[PDB]
Design a protein around this ligand. Structure first.
Ligand SMILES: C=C(O[C@H]1[C@H](O)[C@@H](CO)O[C@H](OP(=O)(O)OP(=O)(O)OC[C@H]2O[C@@H](n3ccc(=O)[nH]c3=O)[C@H](O)[C@@H]2O)[C@@H]1NC(C)=O)C(=O)O
Ligand SMILES: C=C(O[C@H]1[C@H](O)[C@@H](CO)O[C@H](OP(=O)(O)OP(=O)(O)OC[C@H]2O[C@@H](n3ccc(=O)[nH]c3=O)[C@H](O)[C@@H]2O)[C@@H]1NC(C)=O)C(=O)O
Ligand SMILES: C=C(O[C@H]1[C@H](O)[C@@H](CO)O[C@H](OP(=O)(O)OP(=O)(O)OC[C@H]2O[C@@H](n3ccc(=O)[nH]c3=O)[C@H](O)[C@@H]2O)[C@@H]1NC(C)=O)C(=O)O
Ligand SMILES: C=C(O[C@H]1[C@H](O)[C@@H](CO)O[C@H](OP(=O)(O)OP(=O)(O)OC[C@H]2O[C@@H](n3ccc(=O)[nH]c3=O)[C@H](O)[C@@H]2O)[C@@H]1NC(C)=O)C(=O)O
Ligand code: NA
Ligand code: NA
Lengths: 416, 416, 416, 416
C-alpha cells in the first residue's frame, strides 16, 4: 500500500500558503447544526476529516455541499440525533456534534470514542458540562445518551482546560435558558474562532480566549457566513521544516498571535524570524541550539507540534528534553526516529534527545498525524532516502504536503 | 518543642475574617524597592515570612515600619543589591527582590534557593526573563549575579506559567526601556494585585490576569498606598474545614472570583455554598461525595489547597484521586495522614484516596505550610486527640489559626 | 474484516489443555541456529509468530519442517546472516536471531525493531552485551550490524533484567571463547527453558533462573531434542477467565512454579485454587475482592497478564490499582474497557479501577495480543454481545481460543 | 550548629577499611530478640542507628552491651512487646522488631513509621505477611497491633521485593508452626546475612539470596555468634570518591559479589577496577564518561548509591540520565547539587544530568544519609570550599567519614 518517499533535500526556500485550520473547522462545522437555516464556511481545508464530519451531518439530516474551500450547511430540517459507531471510530472529533444536537433536540445518542493513537482520551468533562446544564446521561452498549426537558445555564468548572469539552459545552449552552459560565476554559485560538461563529449566528458568547467564558443562551440561531482561521499547526510544521533544513521560508496567510510559543522556541533554537501582518519569514540557523519543550494548554507549547520539534532536536547541538503534559502516550514516534539514527530515551512523560551528527534514511511508519509529518521532516534532512508507510495518518490533516514541499524545493513523492 | 494539640471537635460554626494574602504581599513588598519614595501597604498579614522579607529590605537599605497590618517602605536610598544566603534559605520568596534590584541598580547578587519541602524548584525561568531583558547572568559560589548596562524591553516566553517568574520579570520590566511582553504568564490573582500596585506607583502594566502581560517601561516610580487582596488560600482552608466538620461557616473579607475552583469542587463534594459580595457561606454535607482533583495553574485547582482537599477525601464516601501537576514532591504529608488511619496510596504524581469511616488521633509532624494546616483539619475530625509537631511550618503562613478555629467552636491549642 | 463475537456466557467449567509457551519457543527456535546439525522441538504451539520466525530461519538458510506440534531445524548449512525489515516489522522477536548468527558467523545485520503497540522498546541492552563480547556495532539505514574477529567471554551488567537481552546474550556467549557472566539477568521461566536447550545441545550454561548466569563457551553445538515448557500466560488467561465468570476450570499441562504470582493474586481476589503436579483447578469467588497489582520482572506479577487482571478488576467489589512498571504505553486497552462500561482512570503508569455492577457488550478493538484476550474475558461477562475487531493480535499468540472457550461452555465465534 | 567543611582536594590515594554493614546489622540486632539466650555480633559499626535500635531492645527488656565493634544481646527475659512513637520516629528500621516480637510473644504493638526524607514508605507488605501467618492486625492511634493464637507457616507473595518486609516476615516465620514460603523475596546481600544468622541460631531458612525463601519454623532458637558482612554502600561511596577525584583507592574488607552493579557502572564510566579476595582497587578515569543508571532491586543498581553516582555525573563528559524506580522522592539533593553549579533537571522519576566543567563550593544542606555523603564527594572536587549543614543525616550511617577521607589525602573537617 501507499508510501511517501522523501530524499535528502535542498534547504527549503520560497513561500507556502497555509490552509484553513482543521481544528477550527471541525467544531465550527458541528456548530452549524445549532442553526435553523444555512451557514457558509469559507477557508475550509480539503481534508478527509472534513469529509467525515460532513458525512456525519448528512447522517443526522443536514444538507451539506462542499466546493473549492467553501462548505455550506442547511440544518433547517435535522431528522435524527444519533452518531453511529463507524463515524466516531473513524474520527473522534465526531463527538463534537453531541453539544449541538442536545441543545437543538433535548436528546442525543453518540458512540463513545475508543482507543486513540496518542493516548487514553476520556470524554468525562464533556459529560460533566452537559449534566451541569440539566442533561441526564446514560450508557447503552458503547453509546452515551444525554437528554433533558430543557437545558438551563449554570456555572461549571473544567478540571482540565479541555479543548473539546470547552467547545461542546459552549455550543450546548448557546441555546440554553439563562447564563452559563465555563471556568478554567481552554484558551486555544480555535475556541475564539468558534465563539466568533456562534456570535455571528446570533449567540451571546463572551470571554473566549480567556480563562472564563460566559454564554447567555438565545432561543434560536440563524445560518451565517464565517471565514475560518488559518491552520496554526500546519504553519508551525513548515516553520520547523525551515529550521531543520537550514532554509528560508515565508509562511503566508497566518496569524502571528496564534504562533507565539512556536516562534519563541524556534528563535531560542537559533532561527531568525520576521513577523509580518499576514505572514512570517523563518530562516534556519546554521547550528541548531538544543532547547527544551514542555507541552501545555495554549498559550503554552502545543502538543500538536511536539513530535515535529522532537525531530528538529534529534540533530541539535546538545541535549534537549521534551515533556508531554497534555497526552499520555504521545511518544509512539520515538522508535521510528530511532530507526533513522536518533538518540532518544524516554521515561514517563519525558524524552531525552541527544543530538546526533545526522539522520539516515530508513523505512518508517507514521503512528499518527503529527508524528507522520515529523517523519517527513526527518526524511528531508536524512542521508539517502526515507520511505514512510501508513500515510493515511498524514493525509487526513495536511493539504498536499507533497506539493507544498515540492514547491519549496524538497524531494518528496506519494506513491500508490 | 512546641506542638499544636487538636481534639475531636464540634462542627465549626460562625464567621471567620480572612487576613491579607501572604502570596500577594510578598511580591508587593519586593516591588516597593522599585520606587524612589515611600509606599504604604494596608492589609498586611502579621506573618513570619512578612517579617523575613522586611528584614531583607532592611539589609539592602530600605526603611521599613510595620504596625497594625500596615507596612511602610521607603526605598529612596537603597545602598546594596546583595541577598545573603541566610535570608533566602529562610524564605525562598526572598528571590523576588532580584527583579526590582536589577531594574533599580543594573546589578544584583542573590543566593540561589536550595531544597524545598515540596519539591525541586528551579529558578531558570526567572533568569531566562532577565537575560531577555539584556542582563548577563553568572554564578558565584551559590549566588546568582545579574547585571546589564540597561534593561531593554523584549518579548519573552515562559515555558511554564510560573507565578514567581512572572512576578520577577514584571517588576524588572517596569523600569526597562521600551515594551516587554510576557507570553504564557501566570494568571494567578496575586499577579493582578502586583500589577495594580505597579500601576499605582506609575507603571504601565496591562494584561495581568490574562495569558499575556505587556509592560511599557517608565523611567521612575513613586511610592503609593495599596490595599492587598485577601488570602484566597486561607479562605479555602476554612471552607474545607466547614466541609470536613459538617459545619456552617461564613468566611468574611474574601473575593469569590479568586475562589472559583475551590467553590466548584466543594459543591461537587456536597457542600451548600452561598456566594456574596464580601463573603461566602459554606455548609458541609452530611455525606462527603468523593471527588477528584488535579492541581493546575490558576484558574485550575490550586496546589496550595491540595493537601487540605486530600484530608477531606480521607473520609469521603468512596475513592478520590489527587493529581499534583504543579510540584514534584508535594505528597510528604501522605505518611502522616496514614498514621491517622487514612488509606492513601501514591504512584508518581497521583494519590488514590480510599475513604475510611473515620480518622483516629495520633502524633504527626507538619512537613510544610499547607500540609500542616491539613493536619489540623484532620485533627478536628479525628477521634481522640492529635498532637502536631514542627508547627513553625504552619505559623509562618496562617495568622492565629488557633484563635480563629477556637472562635468557630473547635478545640485547638498551641503549647510551648 | 474478521471479528470475534462473544456473548454473555455461562460460568466456564471443565478442563483446558495448555499449549507450548510462545515466549519459550521463539528464543529456542532462534537458538537452533547455533548448532551444526538437526534439532527437534516438541510442544511447539501452532501460532503465526512461530511460522514467521520459521520463515526467518528459512531466509538465512536453515531447513525447517513443522508438523503436529513438532518443529525440526537443520542449521548445518546456513548461508546468510541478514534479517530483512519485513520480518522484524512483522514480529520483533525476530531480533533474537542476532545472537546466534553473530556467534556462528562473527557477523550479522538485523533490522532494528520500530514502534510497538505496547511501548517504545529499545534494544540497547542487547547491543551492550554484544559489544562486551567484542562485537563492533554500527547502524546502516535502519539495520544494526554487529561483527567481531571472535567473541570473547566477559562480565556484563544489565541495567534492566531484560528477557530478550538475556536470551540474545546467552545464545551469543554459548560459542564464545571463555566465560561470560550476565549480571542482573532475567529470571523468567523461558530463560531456564532456553538454557536447558543450550545445555542439551552441548553448551555450559549455569545459573539460569537466578540473578546471575555464567556461560562457558564451547567450540561447537549439536542439534538436540527438546520439550518446550507450557505457556504460563495462556494458563493464566484461563485462570482469570474462571475467576471472572465464577466458573470452575482445571488447567491441564502446566507448571505451578511458573504461575506463582498469578495464583497468589487470584487467591487474594477470592478464588479457591488447587495446585497439582501437572494441573491447577481454579474456582472463582462469588464476590471478587478488589486487589492491586504491580507488574515487575519475574517472579513479580507479569505484565503479560496485566490487561487480563485489569479486566477482572472492572467488576470487583471496590477499588483496585494497576501499576505497570515494565512497559511504557501498556494501557491502550483502557479506552476499550471504558466503552464496555468500566470505570478506569489512568495517570502515568497507574490505573485506578473502580469496580462496576456489570459490563455491557459493545464494539471494541484489540490493541495488542494480551489486551485482545482480555476483551474476550470482558465479553464473556458483559451483558448482551461484544464484537471484537483487529483479531490478528489475538490469533498470533493464542491457539484456538474460540474452541477452548467453547469446550468450557462459553459462547464465542470467529467470523470472517 | 555543626557543619562539615570540605575543600577542593587532592586526588584520593591509599587504603580505606570498610566497617560492618549498617543495613545488615539493624535487622540482625532485631533478630537477636528471637532467641532465649545470648547472641554475640562482631563487626558492628559504631553508628547512631545501632545505638537507637539497641535502646529499643533495652526498652522491651533485652540486655544489650556494646564495646569495640561487638554487640551482645541477651533476650532471655523480654518483658514488653511495644515500640514507642519516639524510637520509631527516630529510626524507622525500629519497625523490624515487629516480626521477632510477634513470633516470641504472639502479640506486638509498634508505632507506624511516618514521613521519610526519601519518600512515602508504607509498611503494608510487612502486615500482609503477618496476616498470612495468622496474625490479626489493627490500628490504634498511630500504632499497629498484630496478635495471633499461633503463627502458622503459609505461602505469601510480595507485590514488591521489599527488603524490610522480607526481613520482618523471615524472622516471624522462623518460629512459626510449619513451612512459610516468601515468593518474590528481596535478594539483597543483607537478606542472606540475616538468614545465615537465623540458621546459626537454629532456624531452617533456605533460598536467601534467591527469589524464593522457604522457612521451616522451629520451636525455639538460641543465641549465637555472628560476623556481620561489610557495608557495601560505604564501600561504594569510597569507590565513587576515587572516580570523582581521579584518585587511586584500595577499599579493604569488602565482598566483590555484593558490589557487582557499582563495579560495572564505574568501569563503564572509565574507571580501572581490580577485584581481589578481600578488597578492590579503583583508579579513576581522566575523563569521566557519562553513563545512565536505573535504580532497581538487587542486583540492580542500588538506590542507596544513586545520589553519589548523580554527583559523579555532574562533571561527566556529556549527558547521563538517572532513573529512580525504588523510592518516590529521592531527588531532594538535586537543588543542593544545583547550588554548587550542577546542571540537573528532573521530571517524574528521571533526572537529566548535563555534565559541567566543574562544581563550585557553596553552602549546602544534607537532605538525607546518602545525599549528604554525596555532597561531601561534590565538595572534594568543587572549587573553593563547601560548607555542609544538617550533618546528623551523614553521621547516623557513616563511621568517621572525616577521618577516612583525611587518611586518603582529602581536606575535610567536622566543626561544632
Ligand atoms: C491530536 C489531535 O489534535 C487535538 C490536539 O492535540 C488537542 C490539544 O491541543 O486539542 C484537540 O483535541 P481534544 O479536544 O481531544 O484535546 P483536549 O480535550 O484538550 O485533551 C487534552 C487532555 O485532556 C484530556 N481530557 C479531555 C476531555 C475530557 O473529557 N477528559 C480529559 O481528561 C485528554 O485525555 C488529554 O489528556 C485537538 N483536536 C481537535 C479536533 O481540535 C487530533 O484530534 O487529531
Ligand atoms: C508553597 C508556597 O506557595 C507557592 C504556590 O504553591 C505556588 C503555586 O501556586 O506559587 C508560588 O510559588 P512559586 O512562584 O515558587 O511557584 P511557581 O513558579 O508557579 O512554580 C510552579 C512550578 O513551576 C516550576 N518553576 C518555577 C520557576 C522556574 O524558574 N522554573 C520552574 O520550573 C516549579 O519548580 C514548579 O514545578 C507560591 N509562593 C508564593 C510566595 O507566592 C510557598 O512558597 O510557601
Ligand atoms: C508482549 C510480548 O511479550 C513479552 C513480555 O511482555 C516481556 C515481559 O515479560 O518479555 C518479552 O519481551 P522482551 O524480551 O521484549 O521484554 P524485555 O526486554 O524484558 O522488556 C522489558 C522492559 O525492558 C526494556 N528494554 C528491553 C531491552 C533493551 O535492550 N532495552 C530496554 O530498555 C523494554 O523497553 C521494557 O521497558 C516477551 N516477548 C517474548 C517474545 O518473550 C510480545 O513480544 O508479544
Ligand atoms: C534509605 C535507607 O536504606 C534502605 C535502602 O534504601 C532500601 C533499598 O535498598 O532498603 C532498606 O529499606 P527498606 O527495607 O525500607 O526498603 P524496601 O522495603 O525495599 O523499600 C523499597 C520500596 O518498597 C516500598 N515498600 C516497602 C515496604 C512495604 O510494605 N510497602 C512498600 O511499598 C517502599 O516504599 C519503596 O518504594 C534500607 N534500609 C535498611 C535499614 O536496610 C535507610 O533506611 O536509611
Ligand atoms: Na500515577
Ligand atoms: Na520522566
Amino acid at each position: 500500500m501507499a508510501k511517501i518517499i522523501v530524499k535528502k533535500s535542498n534547504p527549503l526556500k520560497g513561500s507556502v500558503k497555509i490552509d484553513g485550520a482543521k481544528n477550527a473547522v471541525l467544531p465550527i462545522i458541528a456548530a452549524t447544526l445549532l442553526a435553523n437555516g444555512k451557514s457558509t464556511l469559507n477557508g475550509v481545508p480539503n481534508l478527509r476529516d472534513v469529509h467525515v464530519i460532513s458525512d456525519l451531518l448528512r447522517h443526522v439530516g443536514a444538507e451539506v455541499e462542499y466546493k473549492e474551500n467553501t462548505l455550506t450547511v442547511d440544518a433547517s430540517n435535522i431528522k435524527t440525533c444519533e452518531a453511529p459507531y463507524e463515524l466516531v471510530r473513524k474520527m473522534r472529533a465526531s463527538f463534537l456534534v453531541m453539544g449541538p444536537l442536545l441543545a437543538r433536540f433535548n436528546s442525543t445518542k453518540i458512540s463513545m470514542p475508543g482507543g486513540s493513537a496518542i493516548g487514553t482520551r476520556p470524554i468525562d468533562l464533556h459529560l460533566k458540562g452537559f449534566k451541569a446544564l440539566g442533561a441526564k446521561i446514560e450508557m447503552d452498549h458503547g453509546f452515551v445518551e444525554a437528554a433533558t426537558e430543557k437545558l438551563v445555564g449554570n456555572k461549571l468548572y473544567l478540571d482540565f482546560p479541555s479543548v473539546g469539552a470547552t467547545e461542546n459545552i459552549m455550543m450546548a449552552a448557546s441555546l440554553a435558558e439563562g447564563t452559563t459560565i465555563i471556568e478554567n476554559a481552554a484558551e486555544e485560538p480555535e475556541i475564539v474562532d468558534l465563539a466568533n461563529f456562534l456570535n455571528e449566528m446570533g449567540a451571546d458568547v463572551k470571554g473566549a480566549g480567556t480563562n472564563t467564558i460566559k454564554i447567555k443562551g438565545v432561543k434560536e440561531l440563524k445560518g451565517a457566513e464565517h471565514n475560518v482561521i488559518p491552520d496554526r499547526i500546519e504553519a508551525a510544521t513548515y516553520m520547523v521544516a525551515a529550521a531543520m533544513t537550514k532554509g528560508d521560508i515565508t509562511v503566508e496567510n497566518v496569524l502571528m498571535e496564534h504562533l507565539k510559543p512556536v516562534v519563541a522556541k524556534l528563535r531560542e533554537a537559533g532561527c531568525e524570524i520576521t513577523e509580518m501582518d499576514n505572514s512570517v519569514r523563518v530562516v534556519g540557523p546554521k547550528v541548531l541550539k538544543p532547547i527544551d519543550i514542555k507541552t501545555l494548554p495554549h498559550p503554552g507549547f502545543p502538543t500538536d507540534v511536539q513530535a515535529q520539534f522532537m525531530a528538529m532536536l534529534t540533530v541539535a547541538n546538545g541535549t534537549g528534553v521534551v515533556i508531554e503534559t497534555v497526552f499520555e502516550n504521545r511518544f509512539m514516534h520515538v522508535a521510528e526516529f530511532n530507526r533513522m539514527g536518533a538518540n532518544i530515551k524516554i521515561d514517563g512523560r519525558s524524552a531525552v534527545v541527544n543530538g546526533v551528527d545526522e539522520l539516515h534514511g530508513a523505512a518508517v511508519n507514521a503512528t499518527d498525524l503529527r508524528a507522520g509529518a515529523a517523519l517527513i521532516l526527518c526524511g528531508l534532512i536524512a542521508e539517502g532516502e526515507t520511505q514512510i508507510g501508513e500515510i493515511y495518518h498524514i493525509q487526513r490533516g495536511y493539504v498536499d504536503i507533497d506539493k507544498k514541499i515540492t514547491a519549496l524545493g524538497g524531494q518528496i513523492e506519494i506513491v500508490e
